[PDB]
């Protein structure tokens, strides 16, 4: 690595960056590139998992909370449950009854409810001082090796590149995690570039890179408060406390006009690989929340948004509002059995992101749907 408190990706397991990175143009060099056979992807994926796991080791497990919960809605509305339960204290011979609010998605019915992962694994809470804001990481070559960069403006995923430069290392890449739309990445320079391993298959994903960003405004409007509960000897749990004001639904805002222009251009370039057929877009076809919705980390909260309002159109020869859901117990990178609990964040949350690309798949008129939960495709 080369990069530059306590961020989840700032473990200082690797060096600082070069303040003045060098690049050498190789005149008259042709090199065959293939993004689908690029082992740098596997390397990044592994390092990201490691940094995540290292960062979550030194903190509190919530196994003491796997008790039966008594949950109601008596003071919440005219998705959120008010649950009471017993916990331990620093004195092993004492117990007390406490209250907390939980999101419905994290609680499963069986003295009515249980946390969703108590019969499968231990839930570790996020270490409370560790933020999840992406830090650009540069990947740099060891002695004896070199990294070559392709500079062809219209280069897609594979083939000869006629302009190759040697670099000490890559630009910083932000480890942004998302499931349907790509956020905060690089833009294409001249046109939308559609990259795929095999554009004619249905078994392969399509990565579409935009040359213009679309802003997405996301918010969590509820004024949630934080309550700190002592479980044991220096073992603290952070529970959602009460909510001040109205209960409102989390959502994201996308401009209607930019979205439509973006699709006209995506379709225009898709018709260059496909014959002049009708192209339609549909919502993700199925699976769990992680795949059917667009997820992201906004300020430390984990959002799941309904994108059916975007991928619903037919193409032939105002503001869009996406409702969202919030979860505290998550299982990243499809690792079953390794849940993490995100402590609630005090106050209202707002963030503005750049949609820089899309992940699309094809159904066996051509049909495209958003999707692909395999993180290697983002990288």
């Amino acid at each position, epitope marked *: 690595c080369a990069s530059d408190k306590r961020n989840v990706w700032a473990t200082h397991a690797c060096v600082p960056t070069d303040p003045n990175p060098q690049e050498i143009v190789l005149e008259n060099v042709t090199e065959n590139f293939n993004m689908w056979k690029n082992n740098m992807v596997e390397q990044m994926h592994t390092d990201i998992i490691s940094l995540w796991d290292q960062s979550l080791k030194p903190c509190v497990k919530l196994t003491p909370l796997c008790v039966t919960l008594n949950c109601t809605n008596v003071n919440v*509305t*005219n998705e959120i449950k008010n649950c009471s339960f017993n916990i331990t204290t620093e004195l092993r011979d004492k117990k007390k009854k406490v209250y907390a609010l939980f999101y419905r998605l994290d609680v499963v019915p069986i003295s009515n409810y249980r946390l969703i992962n108590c019969n499968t694994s231990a839930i570790t809470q996020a270490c409370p001082k560790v933020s999840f804001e992406p830090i650009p990481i540069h990947y740099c070559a060891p002695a004896g090796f070199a990294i070559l960069k392709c500079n062809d403006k219209k280069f897609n995923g594979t083939g000869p590149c006629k302009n190759v430069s040697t670099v000490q290392c890559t630009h910083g890449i932000k480890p942004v995690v998302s499931t349907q739309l790509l956020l905060n990445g690089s833009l294409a320079e001249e046109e939308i570039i559609i990259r795929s391993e095999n554009i004619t298959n249905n078994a392969k994903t399509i990565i579409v890179q935009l040359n213009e960003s679309v802003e997405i405004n996301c918010t969590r*409007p509820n004024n949630n408060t934080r309550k700190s509960i002592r479980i044991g000897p220096g073992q603290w749990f952070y529970a959602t406390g009460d909510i*001040i*004001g*109205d*209960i*409102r*639904q989390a959502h994201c805002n996308i401009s209607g006009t930019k979205w439509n222009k973006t699709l006209q251009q995506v379709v225009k370039k898709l018709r260059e690989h496909f014959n002049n057929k009708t192209i339609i877009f549909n919502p993700s076809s199925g699976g769990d929340l992680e795949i059917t919705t667009h997820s992201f980390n906004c300020g430390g909260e984990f959002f799941y948004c309904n994108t059916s309002g975007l991928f619903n159109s037919t193409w032939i020869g105002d503001t869009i509002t996406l409702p969202c859901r919030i979860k505290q117990i998550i299982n990243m990178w499809q690792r079953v059995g390794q849940p993490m609990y995100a402590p609630p964040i005090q106050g209202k949350i707002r963030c503005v992101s750049n949609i820089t690309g899309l992940l699309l798949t094809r159904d066996g008129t051509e049909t495209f749907r958003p999707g692909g939960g395999d993180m290697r495709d983002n990288w």
Partner: antibody
Amino acid sequence: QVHLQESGPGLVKPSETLSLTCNVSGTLVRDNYWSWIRQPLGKQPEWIGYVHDSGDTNYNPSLKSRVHLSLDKSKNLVSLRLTGVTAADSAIYYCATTKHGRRIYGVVAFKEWFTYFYMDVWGKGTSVTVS
Amino acid sequence: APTFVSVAPGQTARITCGEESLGSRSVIWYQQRPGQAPSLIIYNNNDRPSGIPDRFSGSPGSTFGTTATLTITSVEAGDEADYYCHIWDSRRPTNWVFGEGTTLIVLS
């Protein structure tokens, strides 16, 4: 100017049916929401329910099974019927028009709003005693 | 049932109602002259209907954690009435009853 003139039996006996009438004048019954309010002596008033056309009628949950409201468009009268009257039902009853509006606090598309009602035009009321 | 307050003529009266707000509200205030049907003074927190003077105003429904307040400035003899309050709240079931009111006593 709308005038609401009420009438009724005055005295009813326990377990009987109380039926009050609001004679509407200056407006037609079909163009207004109507509601009934009762005020036990010495107490703050209670909202019984409201009635209107297009099925927009609702009731105080404690009286839902006992109270029936209707609008007579031929007579321009508002009817209030309460059955199983007891000592607790002695009250001054009132006929009133109802206006409505909306309080919006969030996104309208997600229905983050509510309807509220208020009573602008009130009648004189009638005193009802249950023996 | 009612709360009793009193003011000298010309003084400002402060009338309160209900419990602390939980969510956004739309508070409706009514006035009852003894022996008469009540009438509306304020709806939607601060919108008075025609016929009600500027001396009658109320607290906003945009806040949380506080009770409803009716303010009557320059109180006169004609303001001696019970004041009632009906509160709608976005996080509560519909209130089918009025809360206990306040009797405003005008002195001298």
